[PDB]
Amino acid sequence: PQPISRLEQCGINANDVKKLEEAGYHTVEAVAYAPKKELINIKGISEAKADKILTEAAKLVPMGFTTATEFHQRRSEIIQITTGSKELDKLLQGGIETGSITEMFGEFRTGKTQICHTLAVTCQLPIDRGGGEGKAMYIDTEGTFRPERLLAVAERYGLSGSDVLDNVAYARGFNTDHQTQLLYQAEDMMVESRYALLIVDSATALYRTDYSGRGELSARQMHLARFLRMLLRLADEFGVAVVITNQVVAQVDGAAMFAADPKKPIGGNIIAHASTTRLYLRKGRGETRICKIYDSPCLPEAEAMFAINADGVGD
Amino acid sequence: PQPISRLEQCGINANDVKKLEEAGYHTVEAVAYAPKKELINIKGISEAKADKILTEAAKLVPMGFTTATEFHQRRSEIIQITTGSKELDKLLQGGIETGSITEMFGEFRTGKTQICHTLAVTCQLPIDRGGGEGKAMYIDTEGTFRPERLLAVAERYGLSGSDVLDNVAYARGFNTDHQTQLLYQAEDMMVESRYALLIVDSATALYRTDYSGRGELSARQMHLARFLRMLLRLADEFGVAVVITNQVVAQVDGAAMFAADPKKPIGGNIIAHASTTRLYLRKGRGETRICKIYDSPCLPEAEAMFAINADGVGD
Amino acid sequence: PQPISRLEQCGINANDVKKLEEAGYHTVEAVAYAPKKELINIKGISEAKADKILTEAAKLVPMGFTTATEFHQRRSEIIQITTGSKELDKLLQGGIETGSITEMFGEFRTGKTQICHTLAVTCQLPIDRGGGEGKAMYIDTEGTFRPERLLAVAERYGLSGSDVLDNVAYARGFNTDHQTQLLYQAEDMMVESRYALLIVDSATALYRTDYSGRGELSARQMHLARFLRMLLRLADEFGVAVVITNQVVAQVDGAAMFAADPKKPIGGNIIAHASTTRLYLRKGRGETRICKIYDSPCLPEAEAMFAINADGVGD
Ligand SMILES: Nc1ncnc2c1ncn2[C@@H]1O[C@H](COP(=O)(O)OP(=O)(O)NP(=O)(O)O)[C@@H](O)[C@H]1O
Ligand SMILES: Nc1ncnc2c1ncn2[C@@H]1O[C@H](COP(=O)(O)OP(=O)(O)NP(=O)(O)O)[C@@H](O)[C@H]1O
Ligand SMILES: Nc1ncnc2c1ncn2[C@@H]1O[C@H](COP(=O)(O)OP(=O)(O)NP(=O)(O)O)[C@@H](O)[C@H]1O
Ligand SMILES: [Mg+2]
Ligand SMILES: [Mg+2]
Ligand SMILES: [Mg+2]
């Protein structure tokens, strides 16, 4: 929310800052906690100019250091965007913490791309439905983008079909490095239009298909982190959910029941703690979908069943 | 799609052609669908004019953000290949939606290699009906391709037998490396004509015999992921509905997990998270075969009674 | 095929073929239809050299995409050796078609071993008469082989009877591995002398005793998969009708009120799809016996009153 428009004073030359901001650093906040090396990584950036920013942005930093009392203020404004139905919001303190990247984990049939569809409708509306009064960023690295589902959940919600369709900006991602730069492109529009979702689907999948072999798997984590830490940066720039969805490893050397690791974290590296919530979306009986949060800072763990009704999540 | 000859705008090197086509990439959109990592790995190609490859091919495709309304504007020409019967057409919401990848199960006598024949011959039909355009590439990796069935379903749909055979261009796969390279070259064989259907019959069949099991499993699923990723690239690359005929492992009951556990998708989670739709072609009396919809982001669970006869998948 | 004649040229060094001949590729089609992992373990010139060997084989065999018309033309020359009873000739539209596995299962006294003996006799007949003008490889693994039956069918078809037994080759599999070894030598046998019938009597009968027990030997279905893979390779290379036979296991399942007897062809999904057809013989009434049709890409369910007489199979 703080572009170069705020940081362009007291001798901040204009020529260097457009180039500095062009590489996804459009928000000056990124420059505020930017590595000194990164501050100079972009070509055309003057070194003396980078040293000047080292103090200008630093004094611009809104929260260089704070106490734990203001953490209550930083948490009370979270609207807890409602997951949906009844129990899916009843057991947990609140649907989705604004800024909580979270994580999805299920096999097929579960509907990882349907809870994300009902959440998409539950952002464009006011606090009357616990929405975020903003649009969505549909980062579907799959081909399962079904805004027909978004209109179907828009029918039972009873708002509209025009803006509920228009607002979500789909991010068709074929590459890993083109999804990372697309989300930089989104980082170059969240300044003007207020967002709260960044609904991400199977982000890890492209990394798995591309970064394949044995050693290249460390590069898979390296680039999974280049994406992930930037997701943390943005999701702290506003109160943006940035919900994530992951696939199944299915440990093979694992067996012995409750110890066979049926759904092994496809992202057990860096995301092991980065992912705020770890709902275990699992097919049950008929249309029930039980889930348990392995990691969820302000919750030990629970069990949560939700059905994929004709119009999205429903209990 | 865009011909690779069109990529000569910014003085693109003369012999960049063959070194680009070495990894398929027979279209401009093909490299537009591949990350910088592939191009770097490609020997001979080295680097273009200041990473032109990456900076370009974004200008000629909206690989950024559009709108679901625009997506709905393009989501009315999504051909739904008729099933041959009408009940499955009803369950399928028109048929086989394009820009995805279908899949089926059912072993012994269940009817997967005949629906893929009646589907190709009815995909050769014109745009106005459920046909759209045909000339499907039928990847036979088990040798089950009888063109007599094509003639059987040609009269059922008033199609010119000779023309029907001329349209469909089927091949024979032998091993996994032949499975993958066949479509890497099918890129080129599609770039000059109009195709709409890409049945990979008996998919994940070769992987079962080649890759033994424990101790070679990593390679199997990692080679399966490469296949699915490349196939998705093709589907997004020429807009072709891709049908998959998967086998089944009916031994999850090996641990007597629960009653009625005598079947399981053989591919594994890697393919499970790939296929958009997931059918299930169980067999009953005569030709009354139940087709369930394990996983389909558009259509809910349902069961119809498609009955292949002397004239194709009828009733 | 081509006996590595052209492969032993085009710069290709003999140092390659001498080592590759120690695994069982007595032709070039085996090398062409072999994954990198397969020929990378030759321990002889297995490297980029073997990659060039693969490319050489590819440019020495017809292997690429083609229109359906070519296959349609190459389906009017298939032998379709006559069974001996004109009922199963009407049922199979000519007889046992050459080129793919034709598993025929059942139980004791149904007539499988007798059908194989007759087929083995009829293969030598002139093609226009209904035979194949070839040879046979009875790979009997029970001990059932009685040349007296070949004698008896010889005068049925008015043959000399001497060459009836001089042409039919016979082996004896005493263990599971011995079947694979027999096929490995069989490849060479085809390489010199034409073969049109590769009967493996009770192929899934040694597995029932050697590879016995769930978990005791879960590698029963892996080895069976490799065995059937070898069968596909041989059938594809020399167009041999690999007429496998099978045993049966009763449905001890509580639902034993079912009809068709508690019949469940031994060998699970692994052996049920490599087979194109699946004739299910049952004891009808004395000499006259019923022959149903299971699975089958082409050929719907139908039966045949084949009678096993002293002359062989007839009416
Ligand atoms: N329009 C709909 N109405 C009702 N139920 C639906 C509808 N669309 C999908 N479903 C159900 O919800 C499920 C959604 O699965 P989906 O979200 O596609 O699978 P996933 O586990 O998220 N992974 P993938 O299939 O790889 O995208 C389906 O399998 C159906 O059971
Ligand atoms: N010379 C003959 N004349 C007439 N009928 C015969 C003659 N020899 C055998 N038969 C009949 O045909 C049957 C031949 O056995 P067959 O049914 O082919 O065994 P199988 O069940 O295939 N062998 P296996 O299952 O491996 O023990 C006999 O059981 C008799 O009913
Ligand atoms: N010409 C035909 N006319 C009518 N029905 C047929 C015809 N040919 C085969 N069938 C039926 O279709 C069934 C299934 O054939 P197919 O399409 O090969 O099944 P599948 O389950 O795909 N086979 P597999 O791939 O070996 O598991 C057969 O078992 C017959 O019941
Ligand atoms: Mg789902
Ligand atoms: Mg089919
Ligand atoms: Mg016999």
Tab-separated table of C-alpha atoms in Angstrom, chain A residues 18 47 53 69 82 89 119 132 137 154 173 190 215 231 242 255 265:
chain	number	residue	atom	x	y	z
A	18	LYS	CA	11.415	3.101	-11.441
A	47	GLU	CA	25.400	2.376	-5.715
A	53	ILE	CA	17.914	4.552	0.127
A	69	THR	CA	1.005	-5.267	23.063
A	82	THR	CA	-15.441	-17.445	6.785
A	89	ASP	CA	-16.358	-21.968	10.820
A	119	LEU	CA	-13.733	-18.675	-0.463
A	132	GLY	CA	-12.836	-8.742	2.399
A	137	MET	CA	-6.121	-13.495	-7.632
A	154	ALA	CA	-22.856	-16.936	-6.029
A	173	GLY	CA	0.442	-20.660	-14.949
A	190	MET	CA	-2.431	-4.763	-5.581
A	215	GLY	CA	19.685	-33.079	-6.679
A	231	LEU	CA	4.060	-14.742	-0.595
A	242	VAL	CA	-2.714	-16.089	0.033
A	255	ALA	CA	3.532	-48.549	6.646
A	265	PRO	CA	3.634	-33.052	3.137
